[PDB]
Amino acid sequence: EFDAIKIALASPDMIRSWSFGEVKKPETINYRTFKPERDGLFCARIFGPVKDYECLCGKYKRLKHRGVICEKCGVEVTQTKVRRERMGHIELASPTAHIWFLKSLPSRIGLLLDMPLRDIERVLYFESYVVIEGGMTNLERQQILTEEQYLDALEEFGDEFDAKMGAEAIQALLKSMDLEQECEQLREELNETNSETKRKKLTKRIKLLEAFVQSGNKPEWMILTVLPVLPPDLRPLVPLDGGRFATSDLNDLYRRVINRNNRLKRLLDLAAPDIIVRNEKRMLQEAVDALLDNGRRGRAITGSNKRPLKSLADMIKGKQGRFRQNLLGKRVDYSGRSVITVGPYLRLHQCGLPKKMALELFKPFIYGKLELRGLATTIKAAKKMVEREEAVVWDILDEVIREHPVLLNRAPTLHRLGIQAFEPVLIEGKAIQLHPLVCAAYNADFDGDQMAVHVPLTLEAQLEARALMMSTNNILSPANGEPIIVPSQDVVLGLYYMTRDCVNAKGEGMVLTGPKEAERLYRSGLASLHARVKVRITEYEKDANGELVAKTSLKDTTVGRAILWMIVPKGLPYSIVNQALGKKAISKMLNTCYRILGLKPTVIFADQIMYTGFAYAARSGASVGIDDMVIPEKKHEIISEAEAEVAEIQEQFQSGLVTAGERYNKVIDIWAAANDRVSKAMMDNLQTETVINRDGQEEKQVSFNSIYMMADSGARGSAAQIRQLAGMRGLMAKPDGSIIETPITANFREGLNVLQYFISTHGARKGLADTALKTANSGYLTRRLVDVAQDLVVTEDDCGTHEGIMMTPVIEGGDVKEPLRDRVLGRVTAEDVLKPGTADILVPRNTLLHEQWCDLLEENSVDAVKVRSVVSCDTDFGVCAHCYGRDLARGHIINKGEAIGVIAAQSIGEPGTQLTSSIQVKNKGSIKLSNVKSVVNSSGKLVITSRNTELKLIDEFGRTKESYKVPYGAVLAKGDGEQVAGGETVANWDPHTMPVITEVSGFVRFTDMIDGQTITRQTDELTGLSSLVVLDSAERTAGGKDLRPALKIVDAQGNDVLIPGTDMPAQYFLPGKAIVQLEDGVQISSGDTLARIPQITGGLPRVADLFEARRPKEPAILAEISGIVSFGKETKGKRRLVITPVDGSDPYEEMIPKWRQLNVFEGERVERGDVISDGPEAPHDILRLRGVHAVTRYIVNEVQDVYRLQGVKINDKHIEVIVRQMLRKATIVNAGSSDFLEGEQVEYSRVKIANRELEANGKVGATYSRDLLGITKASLATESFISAASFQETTRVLTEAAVAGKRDELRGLKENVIVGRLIPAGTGYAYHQDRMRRRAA
Amino acid sequence: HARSTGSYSLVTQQPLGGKAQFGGQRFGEMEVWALEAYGAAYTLQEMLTVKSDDVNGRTKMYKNIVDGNHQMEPGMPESFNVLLKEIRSLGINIELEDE
Amino acid sequence: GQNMRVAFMPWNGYNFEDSILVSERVVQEDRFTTIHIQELACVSRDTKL
Amino acid sequence: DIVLNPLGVPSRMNIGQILETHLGMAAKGIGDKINAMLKQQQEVAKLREF
Amino acid sequence: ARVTVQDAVEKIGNRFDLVLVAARRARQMQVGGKDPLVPEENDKTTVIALREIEEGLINNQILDVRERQEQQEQEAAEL
DNA sequence: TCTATATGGACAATTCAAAGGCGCCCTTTTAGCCTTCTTTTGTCAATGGATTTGTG
DNA sequence: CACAAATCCATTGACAAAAGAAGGCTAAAAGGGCATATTCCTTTTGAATTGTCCATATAGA
Ligand SMILES: [Mg+2]
Ligand SMILES: [Zn+2]
């Protein structure tokens, strides 16, 4: 039909083009015979007829006269839905400034005229005149004149002079302004001046005038001369039942505009005084203004009730505009909801769905079926047949139901698995029975949670609900490959109670002939369900390449594991059900069954595991009671002891020995210790306290405490909640967060008295008030996310790049916190991995590192892998299938088509709610150094002279297991290659200290050092050793304010010692508080300390802030460029940093504050990307300095740090795709051949294709500076204006695209969902590619 | 509650509220993303065009559904076209480049 | 409400998440059978016809 | 008459429902004893003392 | 039939082109122009399309070929 | 060398957009209404041939 | 296998209802004209821009 939406300014001639006739009067209807009263806002003449094919005067009332405008009252007899499309205009008596181009924050009429907003409004309010066409008269053009000044001028200049005011003055300016002339002017002046604010304003204005000339617009189309009216059935005056009318608000706003308009025409007919027509033109400007957008300019003209009217811009804007409310999320036919409930007989491809809802939803189908089988002659007869609910409609429903998916849904639809299509089962009742393995996906309790059943009408949508959306097709979470059909709470109790083992039950140690007579020994009443036994299980292995090898052997097992083996399907080993089978073990069982036997056995085994888990959990009667909560017999003793101890601390605070805060932390640590003793006692009495006896005296195994089994299976509750029931509960903190110093010593089996309960209530309500409001935020994080990665869609099978990233195990200070297998599982290698000895050629480049390749990587101890990633992708407008990886769910590689921006945003966002002095080696290893400019101190150790020497512990395997950070000038007892073993401090330094240890030895000389100007003389009493403290700049006097104390070492001859490697003198200037150890005359030895110097947000604002990329408050100023450091002025502040490379130019200069610490030394050398101070990094800076891989590894490691601290799993692919959608823009450094401004910010894809095409020719490509935008700015500065208007503020986006004449060629998912057509993502991708080839064939 | 075809809103020809007006469910943004995350671009299209808003296509869908023919005709949802007349009734001009 | 003989045991998943498994004697003794009273209205208005 | 779930107590931690199940059982036990004294209808001396 | 569409995807790759192939073929069977190949087990036209597709006896190439054959016969209805 | 003079640069107020899921009196002019009229549009009832069996 | 009769399709014609109009009417809707004197209304967070000082570089004295 069409293929792009253009937006531009509407002209007077265009506005008269849409319209069918001026609306002259404000009458709506005739109040007695409610006719559209011509010719007011609902004019039958102008906007159409009121009933189909009937004139208004009643003369013509039949389709015989389609199209004939009547003679008597002139109403074109046509369908009355023309009433809903025909627009009308209003001929404004005076011009009137369109508010959007006058009050949008950067004012378009403002910066077009290069005129401040205040003066433009002083002209528009009819305050002050404005000059136009100054001629030869000694005035400017924009020269603002008040009454006084004009009154002076006009007495002298009746000619060659002119000064309008109000909207006509602005129209005259925009009509006389020439765009090409002033554009050349601005370019020559950009050629002239170089001031950042000046040049920025210049380039902004030049960009606007370029847009406004390149476009077809005009300036004077801003000041409205002819206003349009919306139709009459989009602003209706429908009469609600009761004789009361129910008008819209636009009827009010138009009625007011037209009244003030007609009145102004009169006030110009009577030749009125000036002040009255000025007042009327102001009132009309206000009225047109409050119509186009109300509440923008000044206060909102209030509606009749008492309220601001909802003017047009409030139609479109906000959470309830057309864009988000009626256009992205529609209400839907064929849909219903009722309470959900359990129904465990179900197979997990079906949902029990009630007869009555199903007969209501499926009435078109039933009517067609009945009149097809002939049981009902006409459609009306079929209607009354199904309304009477005869015995044939239920047969017909059971038949038009049969193979037909429905789409259950739950209200907060966080991730893409909360819409799964089931196959209905017709079930009595009024509750939608939902399968019990599905609650983990939907996140459903069965205490009232309602669900919506939509319907796939057509044939293609039944196919997509069956293939794509079915419930047996997404049993793996798209955020990480692990299963989401994990048996949940009763079923794991049933398995954990089957597959356990008492010590002396019936049938202890009797040999069974297979699983079959284990089941018979159980059901017959001869063996206990867990009484250890020898059986003959015959497992299979998939050893042969696709074949099943049989084998049998007397495994030692129990009756329970033997009864459970009758379900493990044919591929798995027996040692997978020969353990205890908690919850981790059972999700593991399903995962390995998925990875060995594919999908169908995993689904049928999921159901068999549900059924047997439910059955034996029922058979166990695992009931809970007040005697299953065993209090330790040592709890009152523990509390008495800790209480007496805290009384001792009360005394030692009353005797002045201890400070207040120290006394506090004393008491608080003592209660933490007693609490942990009570907890550990209850657990030692709770877990094993079953003592038994087999043919002998006494043994003890794990217990059968009902509450303990429920806590040990993984069914419900952790050891924390068990702790609160048995042991004393917690140390409840006051709403300050200042933890109380007397814990609620009593648990829920005893009674919390009134005090203890009232103290529990604080935290109870804080938790509830959070979890109410974490859904406010994290519903907005996902919204911004899935609105930034809207369009990012897998659009090529491969783009053939060699780029990548280096996937390695995170090592968070010593203990590794994520292996390499989880990180490089499913991603495609970019370079062929080599064997550790290099030994070989190994895994090819473009392979996919699925499970078995993680086996080859883990067996051979691979050190690290480089693997292709989305943020190093060369595809245009997409992300190819190899540079992405695989999925999670459907284990194979990503399909050419699938929409990964969305499942990426959803995965990163739906777990939002779940969120809030010396190195000591830990295990075996051989120490390995990293970036170590060490030197031997005067003691013989190893001191490192590089702040960025990370301390590794390379095991003998060939990998890293420890990674600590060694500060500058540490002192290492060990070195590189010196083997060490656990519990061994190999590093030593002091954090409060900062030494200035040099690289040469000799006499210490005070060079350019004077007491009072360079140093202080202040002897310490209790020590006596003098330190002439090196103070900073502005503290010392003025004659030496530029005189800096430098330390430089020499030999006995006086000549300056030559540094190892350099012939430069090592004179070292000291900073403020650089208190020196040894003075002049005292020679310092090797590696000798010269002088000392003195010296978190998290949860999901930390993730919100790593994604919006907000700059921190004290960034860590990176090293702009590589070379040497120097100070030249030291400041009128401040401090001045100078980086002087070895060969390149060096006009660099950075106004560092002297208030901050400076990590580097004045006489040291730093690489770019090195820190020249401390504190957090900034992501913009990381991007500017170290490429994209630096910033992307930063964003990933930070936000995965959050999600991992909270124990959630998210595959890094998704954070990398959001990071790609963050850095999609790039500023043209200097336009190489053609054709951009070198301050312009063009899409990286477009300048990339441009310089690729130009370098394809002979010319010179464009140099581009990659940017990094936050997610809100990233999504709001897009090529397509509909997908920016929908998201967030619609006023700015519409007005900017309007002036810039921007054109939307859809090519997105948000646009093709707005405009009602196939999303170009999954099944629609074929349609859109075929369409792109069907154009331009 | 359940709604095969009922009474439709006035300005934007979509269904009504909940169970008192006999009104379809809300298929809001989050469910649209959950269909875009699959490939259901056919399901989603009939979900926001025929079942909901396309005021000609929805009667012509009911006719097909009774004729034993599960086709559809996509067209332009009426609420988008309300959007065009409301923007275009500002000073803006937003039209459909035809080709 | 009314008090009735409960029992804390998993019963084959008909009380899975928080669901409840009411026996037929509670529906049969009419002990949770409530009485709801609605008010329909047929207003008879005056139209120009 | 109703079969609630064991696995709801340790995680929600409303131990009240269990103590109140137990004491309700005690109470309905005294109810059964008094009903048994009023079916045999022996004397009001035994009822009064019980 | 039918619980899953795994094997039908292993035969017709890409898992969305499966949907389009099955929907085209089910329209053929439903709009009264053709006739199932594999014996219908009392399936609606959708599951029959997917059952056809599983056996390797229908996909996009076969559908194009049959369409061109049957449209050439209508040219051969020129008499 | 010292100061100023301003200028470009770093700093502080101001405004805007976001913040989740199911008075009166009279006078005149106008338009809705009703009633009869006339011409139109169907309905009630005749009057003839061309079409359909019967007989021998 | 022809000749005699009952059963069909067409115009005459008049006759009654029905509608399009027209006038005569009346309810209603819209102007116009008022003269003791009347003098001024009733929640934060972040980003970006704009108006405000600071570093500073240069130019004259
Ligand atoms: Mg719930
Ligand atoms: Zn008319």
Ligand SMILES: [Zn+2]
């Ligand atoms: Zn790629």
